[PDB]
Amino acid sequence: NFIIPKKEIHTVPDMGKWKRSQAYADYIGFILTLNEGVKGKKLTFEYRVSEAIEKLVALLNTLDRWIDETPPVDQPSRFGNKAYRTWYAKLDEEAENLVATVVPTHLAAAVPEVAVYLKESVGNSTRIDYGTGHEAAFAAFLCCLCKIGVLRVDDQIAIVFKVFNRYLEVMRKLQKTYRMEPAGGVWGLDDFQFLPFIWGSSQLIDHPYLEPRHFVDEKAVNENHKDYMFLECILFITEMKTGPFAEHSNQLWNISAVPSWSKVNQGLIRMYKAECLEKFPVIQHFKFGSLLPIHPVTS
């Protein structure tokens, strides 16, 4: 009994319903499960690559190709590029077809529900913006695939190191190519993302030589970014922004003074709960169906 996911958090008082929901419990449990899975490992870790993972990468490559086929247009506005709406319309019409390439035929009934999260994972057409809510929708998308058994426990490392990693590459391409606005202050973690800082800091726990203080060292980032998701995010920032790190990324600057990656990871998880998952402007757009339901969490 699959259900097309719909919005359920309509006003601020509804946040209580969200925090008590099955969806919330399942979502954060998924994030933390992937977090444990990647602990201490480099991106070059030798993991299983299942058929489903390959199809998910192919899916992202299709989105990538569409960007190439949909160049920015000349326009007066100094914010988001209107060609994004052309790209999004293609994804909007093709999302179910794309998801059907990943989901086995006997689970075709789940495709429309799962596809909704894909449609919510790539930014907002109207505002031409992207935020942690879209990133969360992608995690939700992957969570749904685990729930219906398309992705298995053995795929959890590949989910982060291969699929989510590729997703971030495509999102960065969207953000740069279409000049997308951040959807969301001096204490904001990042313009666009959050999850890669959590899973990335997990990779670096008990690292033999890299400490959090090293991520504001351009040399350290340049020499190590290929192995570490956290450092790849920093590299993106230092390419997108000018001047002293403390000026353009104050929250991350202060995080570099945390003595251990272990505490960075713990703190980022607390920040994620408070600044993403308990933030009404983000959660109001979360969609709930059968796989991630709004009903109170079961015991």
């Binding site: 202060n254 995080i255 505490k263 703190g267 980022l268 607390r270 920040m271 408070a274």
Partner: peptide
């Protein structure tokens, strides 16, 4: 500013 205590 206080998530890392």
């Amino acid at each position: 500013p206080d998530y890392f205590l």
